[PDB]
Amino acid sequence: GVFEELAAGQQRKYIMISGKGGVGKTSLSASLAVKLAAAGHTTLVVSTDPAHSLSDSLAQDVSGGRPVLLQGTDLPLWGLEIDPEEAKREFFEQVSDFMNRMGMGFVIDQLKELKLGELLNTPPPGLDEAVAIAKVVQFVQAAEYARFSRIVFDTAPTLALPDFVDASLAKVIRLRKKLNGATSVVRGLFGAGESQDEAVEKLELLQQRVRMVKALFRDKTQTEFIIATIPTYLGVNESSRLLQALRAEQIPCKRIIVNQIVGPQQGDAYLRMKMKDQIAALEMVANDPGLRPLRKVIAPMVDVEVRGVPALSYFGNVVWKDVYDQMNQGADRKFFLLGGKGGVGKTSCSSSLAVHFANDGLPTLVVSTDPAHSLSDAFDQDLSGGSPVKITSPLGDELPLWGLQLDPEQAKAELRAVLATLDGLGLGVISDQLKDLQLGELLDTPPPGVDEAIAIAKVVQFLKAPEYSHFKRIVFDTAPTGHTLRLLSLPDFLDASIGKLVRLRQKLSAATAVKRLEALQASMEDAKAMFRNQQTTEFIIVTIPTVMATAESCRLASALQHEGIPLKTIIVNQVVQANATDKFLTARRADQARALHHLEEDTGPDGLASLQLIKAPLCDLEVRGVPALSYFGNVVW
Ligand SMILES: Nc1ncnc2c1ncn2[C@@H]1O[C@H](COP(=O)(O)OP(=O)(O)NP(=O)(O)O)[C@@H](O)[C@H]1O
Ligand SMILES: Nc1ncnc2c1ncn2[C@@H]1O[C@H](COP(=O)(O)OP(=O)(O)NP(=O)(O)O)[C@@H](O)[C@H]1O
Ligand SMILES: [Mg+2]
């Protein structure tokens, strides 16, 4: 059948379970590894998890950086948990001053204090990932432990990265080559020796490894892919897009699995399942440390999805009205930032907050940093581009609302492009400007959630004649990600900026611009100036009754609380209600064969769509046990 081809041959096969965000990909890949080891393959299963996902989903601790065999079985199976932040840390890491006499002392001391050696020695971002897939081929080629018949990779959710690291490696590698024969003083600005031979020998190797992965993924004999997703519409929608990319960079992908599908027979169980959760979580939201001080709003699910202008107005009646809109008194201007992990509905909320704001007499702006065409699907107007769009699909009335979509990516490369004398001087010994601008950003990309923190700070500045005059309250719907940043990087990313605007200020003088970096300084500091502002601004976490995203939200709120940010509000958004439980099962099961259909027909048979379908039933297990897993395993494969 299906699993027959995955027990197929002696030829080593690397199965990739990949997908996004809590489909069960881990228990999916785990279960597979098990049923595969059962079959007789000496098999290794792999995750890149800081949190040790594979560890407690096996119930045996594999968290050792190198492959761990499992005690308690006669089965041939190995777990592997790889450390990204130590992947780079381990693999990557005469006096004639007659120059000072000519007066060079000033210019050499300014360039040395531009600390180029740092920019040269800073490892390119994302490295360890690309190297990780390679670390795997290493333990298994090495054959130190056993002769590995199959490998099962549970990937980090959702190919450009092996490239960008190769590129940022090549840039750095080419510039240590221009550095072996070089002047005494030139080698001195980088801290570099007279011989780069051993370094460049080693950096070259690393890059060959980074290359080996992009080579292996496309490799037609060993590699195979399997997409994992849940029955929701967007999951099928998204998965299609990832098969587009899969047929694109041309890595073989033969199977999509659907997990957490509800069996018509035993469905009545699932209802009680979800229920124990809602209670557990809600209970937690009640008593949780630090959750206590912030506003709580429990909203129920709704009759059906909110695609429209009136619907949002009424949603607003539910969330912000039946509970307190007394958040509206304050200064004349108000900022509200809603954020939440993906799946919790925070557009329908954020939108509705803006809509309830509109008719209330007050001009308001909703900002969508979500690329998804979210807010475009929200008011159903397709608000596109970067400029404000006036808000109408009413019967005729006062519409004091605008909203705009700022792609956080287009917002980054807009900033990168804007940053694209001393040019000649650096080129003075040899030509470096290309390589050092591009690597000037190799220090710039390292921030994690900042694609959007661009867009936000952009509009923060937008108070002005054309706008600040026009607007009273505004609201930020962040993208379904990490825009919520809970440690102190705010004064410190600002110090990255001022550190390098001051180094650059140092060496602009010694060539006989950077005011832009001063514009960014004021924008960031003005973005910061409102975020930490007590009166005008407040933050909101939108979340759901599943106890996982609950205790997560608690943490992220507990940390955001002591981070100082005025987060005044939580929202537990889709609460199923008991009296409606009958309808809700038939509802979420209705979604199923809808989206299941929307998959069964996607872009013909050929490009993308339907490949080979794997259905995995929802309930009900802890699913953390080894035999549990063999069970899950025999059920699906
Ligand atoms: N089909 C399923 N049947 C029963 N329990 C499931 C199923 N899928 C997931 N779970 C449970 O969901 C929890 C976490 O899901 P998991 O299988 O680890 O998803 P994942 O692959 O790790 N995705 P991610 O959240 O991005 O790491 C575990 O406690 C599992 O027991
Ligand atoms: N209280 C509710 N009752 C019923 N349906 C809801 C409720 N809240 C949200 N929804 C539905 O869930 C969806 C929420 O999607 P959205 O507002 O984009 O946030 P999201 O779930 O994180 N999606 P995305 O941003 O693309 O990752 C909407 O399409 C609504 O139809
Ligand atoms: Mg995982």
Ligand SMILES: [Mg+2]
């Ligand atoms: Mg959203």
